[PDB]
Amino acid sequence: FEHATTVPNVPGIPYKALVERAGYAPLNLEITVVSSELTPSTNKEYVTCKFHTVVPSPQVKCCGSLECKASSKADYTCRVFGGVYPFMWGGAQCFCDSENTQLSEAYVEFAPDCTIDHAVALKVHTAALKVGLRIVYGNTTARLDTFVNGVTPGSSRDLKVIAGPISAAFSPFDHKVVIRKGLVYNYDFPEYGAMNPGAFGDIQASSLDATDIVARTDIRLLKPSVKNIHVPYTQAVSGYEMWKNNSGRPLQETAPFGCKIEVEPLRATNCAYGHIPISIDIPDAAFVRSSESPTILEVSCTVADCIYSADFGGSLTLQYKANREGHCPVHSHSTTAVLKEATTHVTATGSITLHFSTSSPQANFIVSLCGKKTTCNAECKPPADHIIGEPHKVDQEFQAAVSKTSWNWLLALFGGASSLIVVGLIVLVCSSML
Amino acid sequence: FEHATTVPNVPGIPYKALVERAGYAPLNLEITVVSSELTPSTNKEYVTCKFHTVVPSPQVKCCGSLECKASSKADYTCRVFGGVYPFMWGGAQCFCDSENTQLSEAYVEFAPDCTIDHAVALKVHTAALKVGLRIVYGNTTARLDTFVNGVTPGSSRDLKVIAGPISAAFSPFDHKVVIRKGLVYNYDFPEYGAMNPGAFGDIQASSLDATDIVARTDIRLLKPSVKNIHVPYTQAVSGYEMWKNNSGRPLQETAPFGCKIEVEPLRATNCAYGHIPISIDIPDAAFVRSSESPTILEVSCTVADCIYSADFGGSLTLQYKANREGHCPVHSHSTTAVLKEATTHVTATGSITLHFSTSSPQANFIVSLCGKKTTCNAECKPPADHIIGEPHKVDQEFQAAVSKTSWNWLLALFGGASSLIVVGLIVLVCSSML
Ligand SMILES: *[C@@H]1O[C@H](CO)[C@@H](O)[C@H](O)[C@H]1NC(C)=O
Ligand SMILES: *[C@@H]1O[C@H](CO)[C@@H](O)[C@H](O)[C@H]1NC(C)=O
Ligand SMILES: *[C@@H]1O[C@H](CO)[C@@H](O)[C@H](O)[C@H]1NC(C)=O
Ligand SMILES: *[C@@H]1O[C@H](CO)[C@@H](O)[C@H](O)[C@H]1NC(C)=O
Numbered sequence A, B: 001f002e003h004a005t006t007v008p009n010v011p012g013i014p015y016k017a018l019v020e021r022a023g024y025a026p027l028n029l030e031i032t033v034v035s036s037e038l039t040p041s042t043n044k045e046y047v048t049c050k051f052h053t054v055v056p057s058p059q060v061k062c063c064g065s066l067e068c069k070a071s072s073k074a075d076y077t078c079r080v081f082g083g084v085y086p087f088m089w090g091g092a093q094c095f096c097d098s099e100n101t102q103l104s105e106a107y108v109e110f111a112p113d114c115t116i117d118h119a120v121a122l123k124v125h126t127a128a129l130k131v132g133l134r135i136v137y138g139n140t141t142a143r144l145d146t147f148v149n150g151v152t153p154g155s156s157r158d159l160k161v162i163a164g165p166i167s168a169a170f171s172p173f174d175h176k177v178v179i180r181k182g183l184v185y186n187y188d189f190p191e192y193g194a195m196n197p198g199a200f201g202d203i204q205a206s207s208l209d210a211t212d213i214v215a216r217t218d219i220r221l222l223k224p225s226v227k228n229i230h231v232p233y234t235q236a237v238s239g240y241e242m243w244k245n246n247s248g249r250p251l252q253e254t255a256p257f258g259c260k261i262e263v264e265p266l267r268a269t270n271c272a273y274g275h276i277p278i279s280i281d282i283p284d285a286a287f288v289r290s291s292e293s294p295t296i297l298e299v300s301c302t303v304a305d306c307i308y309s310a311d312f313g314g315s316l317t318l319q320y321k322a323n324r325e326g327h328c329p330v331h332s333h334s335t336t337a338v339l340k341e342a343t344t345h346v347t348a349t350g351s352i353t354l355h356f357s358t359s360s361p362q363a364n365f366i367v368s369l370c371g372k373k374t375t376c377n378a379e380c381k382p383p384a385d386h387i388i389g390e391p392h393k394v395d396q397e398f399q400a401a402v403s404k405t406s407w408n409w410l411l412a413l414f415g416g417a418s419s420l421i422v423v424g425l426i427v428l429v430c431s432s433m434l
Helices: A239-245 A404-433 B239-245 B404-432
Strands: A002-008 A012-019 A027-048 A059-062 A077-082 A100-106 A119-135 A142-147 A160-163 A176-180 A183-185 A203-205 A213-215 A219-221 A233-235 A260-262 A267-269 A275-281 A296-304 A315-322 A337-339 A351-358 A365-369 A372-376 B002-008 B015-020 B026-048 B059-062 B077-082 B100-106 B119-137 B140-147 B154-156 B159-163 B176-180 B183-185 B219-221 B233-235 B260-262 B267-269 B275-281 B296-304 B315-322 B326-329 B337-339 B343-346 B351-358 B365-367 B374-376
Touching: A002 A012, A002 A027, A027 A275, A027 B026, A077 A219, A100 A219, A119 A160, A119 A275, A142 A160, A296 A365, A296 A372, A315 A365, B002 B015, B002 B026, B026 B275, B026 B326, B077 B219, B100 B219, B100 B233, B119 B159, B119 B275, B140 B159, B296 B374, B343 B351
Parallel strands: none
Antiparallel strands: A002 A275, A012 A027, A027 A119, A027 A203, A027 A267, A059 A100, A077 A100, A119 A142, A119 A176, A160 A275, A176 A183, A203 A213, A219 A233, A260 A267, A296 A315, A315 A351, A337 A351, A365 A372, B002 B275, B015 B026, B026 B119, B026 B267, B059 B100, B077 B100, B119 B140, B119 B176, B140 B154, B154 B159, B159 B275, B176 B183, B219 B233, B260 B267, B296 B315, B315 B351, B326 B343, B337 B351, B365 B374
């Protein structure tokens, strides 16, 4: 037998269902989303960190003018100064006091402590959720991990589970993200080659140890104003440091739908943003014949102090009478109230209490003790507590959320208005035929 | 100096331009696309090959029965055979001739030659184009590589050029591709875990050496008929070899805009499909003063035997009245005709010749001989050769594709009909005032 149903993406919060077969007994169906993960397909655009702005020794030639050729090093800024008189310790460094040439060289490199402190720029594509499911059908508890794609038959034991395509995906990661020390940022980093100075991506490379290092940080070499040797240079502030100053908050503190963000690999776990269409191929071994199932005669609901809340507020007792011994499932067919229990060992002519939760002010739903569908009615008071530490077990649907007294009052006013309108029109009609 | 232009994406057939400042004279601009490549972002979604379907030794236990536990091996299928009596060399194997048990196991595994004969199933996303550009200005020729995103400063030794966003990338690779032995295919392979027997992807892994191999080939174990110790099994045929049977043609042979597909990395080179906006910053070291540039006083043009074709057919001769020896550029200011040469040596009051190609029967265009403009008129013939081995240097527009003689006849008829209608209406006007 194949049962196709729809489960909310909330972690925990067990989902009830009834499996009714024409040739077998109804079966309790439990579906719990124990965990989920939204893993995007990512690629490494580049990696960046603080630079080193290492400066080589100046090249001095005296009565001779020399030029410097191009180099493949990042930020290869090279300047030529004439008329310099270099002077280290001991004495003047050379001769030709009026005619010299000092060559000053500058090029950036990754800082030595960039193996730890480095930001990797990733491009994020579409993400496919992988859901961890637990099914407690017919005293058989199967734990499985399956992909939400609609084509993958991934399940354990003889059970088979296909999770259909998700109702809607929101992609918490933007198309460009930045990962640093386990922190994820939705930052629009510049592309490879596109390199603003003094901001993020000022120095780039394909890998940390890659020799193809590129940068466009503004290095300006200046003429030495003191009669010594050195390379005076003005440089833009490190854009990695400026980004770390103004990084904002990581995605772990701003992800919608309560997504908990991890890296290696990048993923969003324990999200809740929609409904999974799931098809389950239940084995025939767990199914029990209707002849062996106790066919129950008559039941009735009597509710005791129901409170509509996120908690299991409300305990109703069922008055039943059954032909023989044996257990049978319980289920609430309405999508408004949920029942805590799933199987009771009913015996004969007694009463069993069950705790239930609901959201609507009025509790009209269907209890299916041994499959005996019975409509149950109750009046529930608003909860006294304001904030609760556990999530709601059912979503409002805005048709039963209107209370019975309010429903009756609205239909009373519209019925009275329509009645006076119709009697006005029929007075017009009978005056017209006169 | 920022010059904005829009060059064709076609490799070869170089693009001519004239850059003219207010006061630093005209200068040539020779923009050549020597190479291009589309390198899309891909991720390994699985790898597949033939399976070995290694069958382990049977486990025969007697005077009893045993069951086998499920394993994590790829496509594990195990069965229990009752009432066997094996005969390998030496006679019967054990006691309870009527009560025996044979345990048969079967699982698949990559073939020993899967290191080469393997198909990598990849998901492909949007691609970024990268151009090799040969830019000639003055006497300087520079070769330089630029990404096509409008943001990346592709630079020569001294040049700053930006390749703007492409008109419309066509993406020859679909969302799913398969790479085998250097041949790529646009194949809609099943996802991870979505195995089916007798089709591509029936065995899957993240790598050739990955232990987590999963497969769902239709394998079944059968009861042995002859009383020996073999394991009779029957399995569905390998969908890898079935896919190689009818893979169709690779993308190297079936690709729009006819461009060469390579692997490692997966790229599409020399794809002529559009127009690249180019904003180039010409250095001022080549912008000569207008006074030093030898200007001309009187310019006249003629043309002999214009043949419109992809080849540079047509010789156009200019009579000039220059005042100084030197050289200065030439350019055609029509999108319909393009000149062969860029700069011409000019002495004084002489005659020069140029070659050009056009796609219109009429050649009504503008030659800018060394600063100023001069119009030229012609009537070009269709070429004798039906097929030429080189692409066209210009496109076709509806205004130029109609010949001057045909333009005359068509407007002669249209204007005759229109003026005939207007003269009918004015005869109506003079009759109505009567
Ligand atoms: C299912 O579980 C209940 C509670 O443990 C047990 O008493 C009952 O016999 C079980 N039903 C079957 C059919 O095994
Ligand atoms: C950024 O740096 C400035 C100093 O320039 C400092 O005052 C400030 O706290 C830093 N952080 C933010 C978020 O502005
Ligand atoms: C370019 O070269 C020509 C001849 O090749 C020479 O006469 C001239 O000096 C050069 N002009 C410029 C502007 O570089
Ligand atoms: C497929 O393999 C069969 C052999 O069974 C062969 O006859 C046939 O030509 C192959 N190709 C196609 C397209 O069927």
